[PDB]
Amino acid sequence: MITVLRINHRPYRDKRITTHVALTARAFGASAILVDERDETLENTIRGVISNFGGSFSIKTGCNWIQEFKHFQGIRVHLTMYGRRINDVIDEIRNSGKDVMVLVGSEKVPIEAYEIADYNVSVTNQPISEVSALAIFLDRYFQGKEFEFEF
Amino acid sequence: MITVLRINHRPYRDKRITTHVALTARAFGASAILVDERDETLENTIRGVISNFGGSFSIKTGCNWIQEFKHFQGIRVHLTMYGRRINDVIDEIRNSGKDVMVLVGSEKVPIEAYEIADYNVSVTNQPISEVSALAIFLDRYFQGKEFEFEF
Ligand SMILES: CSC[C@H]1O[C@@H](n2cnc3c(N)ncnc32)[C@H](O)[C@@H]1O
Ligand SMILES: CSC[C@H]1O[C@@H](n2cnc3c(N)ncnc32)[C@H](O)[C@@H]1O
């Protein structure tokens, strides 16, 4: 099972981007998303989609991201442009058996992300979006099969 | 060569999402992005990245999207949740030889998108983001090789 940890969410600014992270997480095979800043509006919007499109994905907001990431029972992945090439590490991760927590920020990433993560992982070495980084991470994790998943 | 056509851009609201579409386009192997609403700020931000990270990607804003899409010399792809499965059609598209224009909207898509497109293409049947839809479309088009591209 993969859980997404979305940090640097600003509820009075980032409704759309974080919504897109959550939709992406769900569609590409993650079981849950945890969001650092409490946002009831976001929760409502995503629960609306879960209701209408099905499946058992969950969203929590207002999380202590450092403690979640530090104490997660499984592999801690941090998506970052400065990390190791996804294609270099994805097979180890997948073949490990373990649950995975994948951290995506909004560009202003704290140092604790690098300090905690088991793997710091780049999806290309170019500046992209947390949304596209996550989509590619999950696609590679699931070897493209997440297209066969039914909700 | 692939060009991205981003429509439904609202300059006084959608700076971040559209920026992410543009970054994603560039990193995943598109040659250009055309944006419907004029946005000099966006152009400046993306030209900043092109300068600093290299390569020859281009951005134009203020485009007549219907006329661009209608008269594009090549295959017109519209990314939409209601389309044909990407995996069903991507090989035809790739093997055609032709340049490709890929249209991504912001959810409120006009009918002209369906009317013009050579292929209406779904990346999963679930609601996702234009950013993640595009990333997957380009990855599949390039068969994952866009990770070997140098800027
Ligand atoms: C607002 S974009 C910044 C965030 O997107 C993600 N990100 C951006 N570019 C990349 C990249 N090249 N590889 C992996 N993750 C990235 C990271 O999680 C970062 O915290
Ligand atoms: C604000 S999200 C709406 C836009 O994202 C893209 N999009 C969203 N969901 C999908 C999907 N499942 N497959 C393909 N494109 C999609 C389409 O281009 C749409 O115009």
Swiss-Prot record, chains A, B:
Annotated transmembrane regions: none
Top-level taxon of origin: Archaea
Positions of S-adenosyl-L-methionine binding: L79, G105, S106, E107, K108, V109
Localization, UniProt: Cytoplasm
UniProt subunit comment: Homodimer.
Family recorded in the similarity comment: Belongs to the aTrm56 family.
Role: Specifically catalyzes the AdoMet-dependent 2'-O-ribose methylation of cytidine at position 56 in tRNAs.
Protein name: tRNA (cytidine(56)-2'-O)-methyltransferase
The organism of origin for this protein: Thermoplasma acidophilum (strain ATCC 25905 / DSM 1728 / JCM 9062 / NBRC 15155 / AMRC-C165)
Residues included from the entire protein: 1 to 151 of 339
